[PDB]
């Protein structure tokens, strides 16, 4: 179960950092979750029902679908808020990224604590652009939505080409595969971190050959 | 048949009906919102809360006429725009196909895959040009289900295809995609 990674990239105004991030995360998390399991003593379990809803963006001409859990939404909005604060207060660089990683917990013999193994990680890099006019604003609200369309498309397409998923737990193994802390949804064990990066340059070789 | 076959034919039937419902439901011009439930009902197919609208259920059962997608036999939902002048133009042809290749290695895994495919369908239906169009309704959006024999030339030259996804089953693999202007 070696880890699989995907890299998305988006160019937005600061105002739309949150919604953009919220659009990507939620899209991934809609595919990487299921109904809550209720186990019986016999070992079987029933699966609950996941709701979905539409989110119209206020700073992007865009709508995305998310699971109807409000705990999950408040969590992701919070970590994305951490990302926006760090990004704003980083200043000139303006090269930020967030990673959403899915992992299993594997039990180790004492004294070693259980090892978290990633099976899939999503990184999205944010390029923030400064706008001067109200017109640039209005066009940006459209073009960013058009770009997030192809982002969601590629997330779905990749979601089909990934053939690996952890195998359904038993009542005791559940918390090594699923996050069971929410009321309305049962996400795969995930982890959202972020990182502010310094921009680097580009090599010249084959570009010479092209010239 | 073997129990897997009745369960599977049922799964593909309700996947098809729910597919029609999600596609038509993403073009009414208003937002869709359903609630999660840890104490579910016997009618929450694929562990998704998708409320059927009886009329669309009726048109889908009449288009299917009581049969399943198969080789050379695919279910299509066509979304068009009609203006005040009467110009008709198809915008989307959503296609639910059944490929030949069977998956022998693969009961509820196919059920789970079809649930995931419906979640992908939910996501993709909103990132198509016809979504932003259908939300702002002048003009009126139209839907129509049929069981072909799929052909797209009504979408003119140069249409692109988004593959919502595929699900292998022991009778064949299901492909859900959309051809749009």
**The two structure tokens encoding residue B2:** 């073997």
- What phi and psi, each to the nearest 5 degrees, are found at residue B130? -65, -20
Residue bearing tokens 């992701």: A76
DSSP element (H, E) containing B121:
helix B108-124
DSSP element (H, E) containing A207:
helix A205-210
Rounded-to-integer distance, Cα A79 and Cα A31, Å: 20
Taking the alpha carbons of B24, B26, B30, B36 in that order, is the dihedral positive or negative? positive
What is the number of domains present in chain A? 1
Q: Which letter, b or e, does each residue of B114-142 get, where b requires 16 or more Cβ atoms within 10 Å of its Cβ?
A: bbbbbbbbbbbbbbbebbbbbbeeeeebe
Selected residues 25-84 of chain B with any CB under 8 Å from a CB in chain A: 31-41, 44, 47-49
Rounded to whole angstroms, what are the CA distances from B63 to B20, B31, B60, B66?
11, 26, 5, 8
- In chain B, the domains with their CATH numbers are 1-181 (3.30.900.10)
β-strands A4-12, A115-128: how paired?
A: parallel
Expressed as residue numbers, the domain containing A147 is 1-211
Contact status of B175 with chain A (Cβ, < 8 Å): no
Question: If you ran DSSP here, which 8-state letter would residue A210 be given?
Answer: H
What residues of A are in contact with residue B126 (Cβ under 8 Å)?
A: 54, 63-65, 152
Minimal-distance CA residue of chain B relative to A50: B36
| Inter-chain touch A31–B116, beta carbons under 8 Å | yes
DSSP assignment string, A136-185? HHHHHHHHHHHHHHHHHHHHHHHHHH----PPPP-TTTGGGTB----SS-
* Residue B178, Cβ density class (10 Å: 0-12 exposed, 13-18 middle, ≥19 buried): buried
Residue B17 contacts residue B57 (beta carbons within 8 Å): yes
Rounded-to-integer distance, Cα B171 and Cα B181, Å: 32
Report how far apart the first and last C-alpha atoms of chain A are (Å, whole number).
43
Q: How was this model experimentally determined?
A: X-ray
Rounded-to-integer distance, Cα A132 and Cα B139, Å: 36
Contact status of B161 with chain A (Cβ, < 8 Å): no
Question: If you ran DSSP here, which 8-state letter would residue A16 be given?
Answer: G
Rounded-to-integer distance, Cα B101 and Cα B166, Å: 12
**The two structure tokens encoding residue B7:** 């369960």
Residue A134 contacts residue A34 (beta carbons within 8 Å): no
* Residue B167, Cβ density class (10 Å: 0-12 exposed, 13-18 middle, ≥19 buried): buried
Rounded to whole angstroms, what are the CA distances from A131 to A17, A22, A74, A148?
14, 22, 29, 19
What residues of A are in contact with residue B29 (Cβ under 8 Å)?
A: none
For residue B175, what are the β-bridge partners? B97, B166
Residue bearing tokens 């859900």: B176
| Inter-chain touch A157–B163, beta carbons under 8 Å | yes
What residues of A are in contact with residue B49 (Cβ under 8 Å)?
A: 49-52, 68
Q: Give, in degrees to the nearest 5, the angle at Cα B81 between B78 and B82.
A: 125
Resolution in A: 2.5
Interface test with B, best of A10, A28, A35, A55 (most B CBs within 10 A): A35
């Amino acid at each position: 179960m070696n880890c699989r990674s995907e890299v998305l990239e988006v160019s937005v105004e600061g105002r739309q950092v949150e919604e953009a991030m919220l659009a990507v995360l939620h899209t991934v998390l809609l595919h990487r979750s299921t109904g809550k399991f209720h186990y019986a003593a016999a070992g079987t379990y029933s699966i609950g029902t996941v709701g979905t809803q539409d989110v119209d963006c206020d700073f992007i001409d865009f709508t995305y679908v998310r699971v109807s859990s409000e705990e999950l939404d408040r969590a992701l909005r919070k970590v994305v808020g951490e990302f926006k604060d760090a990004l704003r207060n980083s200043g000139g660089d303006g090269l930020g990224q967030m990673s959403l990683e899915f992992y299993q917990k594997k039990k180790s013999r004492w004294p070693f604590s259980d090892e978290c193994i990633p099976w899939e990680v999503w990184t999205v890099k944010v390029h923030v652009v400064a706008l001067a006019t109200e017109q640039e604003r209005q066009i940006c609200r459209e073009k960013v939505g058009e770009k997030l369309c192809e982002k969601i498309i590629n997330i779905v397409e990749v979601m089909n080409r990934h053939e690996y998923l952890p195998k359904m737990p038993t009542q005791s193994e559940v918390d090594n595969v699923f996050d069971t802390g929410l009321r309305d949804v049962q996400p795969y064990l995930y982890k959202i971190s972020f990182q502010i990066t310094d921009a680097l340059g580009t090599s010249v070789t084959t570009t010479m050959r092209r010239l | 048949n073997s129990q897997d076959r009745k369960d599977l034919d049922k799964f593909i039937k309700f996947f098809a009906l729910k597919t029609v419902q999600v596609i038509v439901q993403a073009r009414l011009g208003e937002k869709i919102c359903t609630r999660s439930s840890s104490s579910p009902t016997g009618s929450d197919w694929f562990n998704l809360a998708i409320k059927d609208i009886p009329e669309v259920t009726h048109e889908a059962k009449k288009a299917l006429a009581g049969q399943l997608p198969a080789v050379g036999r695919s279910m299509c939902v066509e979304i068009s725009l009609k203006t005040s002048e009467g110009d008709s133009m198809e915008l989307e042809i959503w296609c639910l196909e059944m490929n030949e290749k069977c998956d022998k290695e693969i009961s509820y895994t196919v059920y789970n895959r079809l649930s995931l495919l419906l979640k992908s369908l939910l996501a993709i239906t909103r990132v198509t040009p016809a979504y932003r169009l259908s939300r702002k309704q002048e003009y009126v959006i139209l839907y129509r289900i049929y069981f072909g024999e799929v052909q797209l030339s009504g979408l003119g030259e140069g249409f692109q295809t988004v593959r919502v996804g595929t699900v292998g089953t022991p009778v064949g693999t299901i492909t859900l995609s959309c051809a749009y202007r």
